[PDB]
């Protein structure tokens, strides 16, 4: 079961990369929130600088380990302040 879940995970990750490269921000947000994907919504919401939806998703996914990726992507983007 976990093999199926993980393989599903990476496969749709690569499936879904291209239009993320290309834009279409509103639709990206809609689909990702519908299926509950934390990191993608993160990176889009900060390259849109919308801290407001940042908090709203943090509140929504407090039990869903949002903050780990938050700290991560903060670290790679060098705003440790």
């Amino acid at each position: 079961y976990n093999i199926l879940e993980m393989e599903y995970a990476q496969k749709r990750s690569e499936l879904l990369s291209p239009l993320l490269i290309l834009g279409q921000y509103a639709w990206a947000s809609n689909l990702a929130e519908k299926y509950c994907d934390f990191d993608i919504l993160v990176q889009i919401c900060e390259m849109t600088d919308n801290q407001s939806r940042l908090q709203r998703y943090m509140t929504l996914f407090a039990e869903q380990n949002f903050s780990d990726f938050l700290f991560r992507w903060y670290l790679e983007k060098g705003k440790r302040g």
């Binding site: 995970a9 990750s13 239009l19 689909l31 994907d37 993608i40």
Partner: peptide, 8 residues
């Protein structure tokens, strides 16, 4: 949809 991590 989701994307994991990549960079130049």
């Amino acid at each position: 949809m989701k994307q994991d991590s990549a960079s130049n």
